[PDB]
Amino acid sequence: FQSMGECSQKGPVPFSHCLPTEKLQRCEKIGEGVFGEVFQTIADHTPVAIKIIAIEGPDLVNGSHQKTFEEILPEIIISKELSLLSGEVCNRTEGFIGLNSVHCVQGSYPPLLLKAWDHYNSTKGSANDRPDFFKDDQLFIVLEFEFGGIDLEQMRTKLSSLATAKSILHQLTASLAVAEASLRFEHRDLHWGNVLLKKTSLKKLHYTLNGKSSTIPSCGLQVSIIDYTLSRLERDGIVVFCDVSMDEDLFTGDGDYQFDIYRLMKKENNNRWGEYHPYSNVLWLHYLTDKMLKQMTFKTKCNTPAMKQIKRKIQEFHRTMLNFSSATDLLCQHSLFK
Ligand SMILES: [Br-]
Numbered sequence: 001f002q003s004m005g006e007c008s009q010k011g012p013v014p015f016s017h018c019l020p021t022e023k024l025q026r027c028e029k030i031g032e033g034v035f036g037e038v039f040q041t042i043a044d045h046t047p048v049a050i051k052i053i054a055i056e057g058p059d060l061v062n063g064s065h066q067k068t069f070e071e072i073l074p075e076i077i078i079s080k081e082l083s084l085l086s087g088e089v090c091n092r093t094e095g096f097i098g099l100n101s102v103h104c105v106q107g108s109y110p111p112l113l114l115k116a117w118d119h120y121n122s123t124k125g126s127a128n129d130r131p132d133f134f135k136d137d138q139l140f141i142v143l144e145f146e147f148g149g150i151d152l153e154q155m156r157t158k159l160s161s162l163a164t165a166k167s168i169l170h171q172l173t174a175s176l177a178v179a180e181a182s183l184r185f186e187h188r189d190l191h192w193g194n195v196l197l198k199k200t201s202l203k204k205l206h207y208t209l210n211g212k213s214s215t216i217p218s219c220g221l222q223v224s225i226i227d228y229t230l231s232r233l234e235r236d237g238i239v240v241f242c243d244v245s246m247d248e249d250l251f252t253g254d255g256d257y258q259f260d261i262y263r264l265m266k267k268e269n270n271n272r273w274g275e276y277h278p279y280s281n282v283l284w285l286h287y288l289t290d291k292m293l294k295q296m297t298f299k300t301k302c303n304t305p306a307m308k309q310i311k312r313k314i315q316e317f318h319r320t321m322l323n324f325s326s327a328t329d330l331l332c333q334h335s336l337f338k
């Protein structure tokens with residue numbers, strides 16, 4: 001059955017099942033990576049994000065081999081488990097992106113999606129191949145997600161002040177703590193492309209950690225964590241993860257603290273990716289804090305002593321947080337969140 005048993009279709013479906021004409025006509029490309037392509041579209045008056053990944057074929061795509069169904073399953077399972085946290089009780093968070101559906105699709109790439117792909121290439125430029133070379137037996141996974149807003153990297157110059165950065169870090173830390181508590185989760189790839197921001201009218205956001213409910217002032221933004229391609233979790237001692245023990249390229253990047261995090265995770269876990277090392281979540285949170293202080297630039301600087309105080313508190317977080325053992329330890333014990 002399609003969509004993990006929640007769609008009535010069996011066997012692959014055509015793209016038209018996921019992207020009926022009007023939905024497909026409203027697709028605009030919003031993102032990419034070596035994995036494939038991300039489109040935004042609308043249905044029932046509501047934006048969604050569609051992630052499309054080629055699988056099972058022999059062609060290089062964006063310079064890399066396609067994943068098998070077995071290799072893509074972890075991302076699908078982890079997307080679902082983290083989405084479900086929004087509806088749980090003892091460990092509840094809306095801080096991971098909602099998963100609406102997952103389909104296995106068969107066919108060549110829709111020409112209307114090529115149109116969208118071309119528009120992005122013309123205006124922003126793409127590092128990917130134009131996905132026009134797939135035959136009509138090609139398989140894809142199509143993941144339909146809640147539209148989460150705009151990534152933190154694209155918001156580098158767009159946020160109001162460091163007070164917003166405090167809310168963002170708090171929301172991230174809380175979501176990761178809840179996922180640690182419920183699922184022994186590690187994100188493992190939480191670069192600033194994978195932190196999404198969208199406007200909310202809610203003044204505060206709610207989470208529950210091990211049965212204790214708390215709130216976070218929103219500063220008008222809701223944070224969603226995305227992209228579980230490197231993630232790990234477990235339920236009842238069954239571990240779901242991406243084994244990168246024999247990957248070379250992942251540990252040889254340069255030019256950004258991001259690339260050190262892969263090496264630092266490998267140090268922490270002795271290259272055993274099945275194990276649970278929630279310190280990796282601290283490492284990513286440190287990388288994000290570092291971005292907030294070094295690369296983000298805010299419309300309003302810390303001009304008053306009260307704002308210089310928030311700056312000082314985030315600088316204090318940056319220099320102390322690596323002495324905490326997990327996001328849960330940070331959330332529960334760090335002074336920033338009291
Ligand atoms: Br994603």
Ligand SMILES: [Co+2]
Pocket residue numbers: 002003007008009017103
């Ligand atoms: Co369906």
Ligand code: NA
Pocket residue numbers: 094095096097098223224225
């Ligand atoms: Na969310």
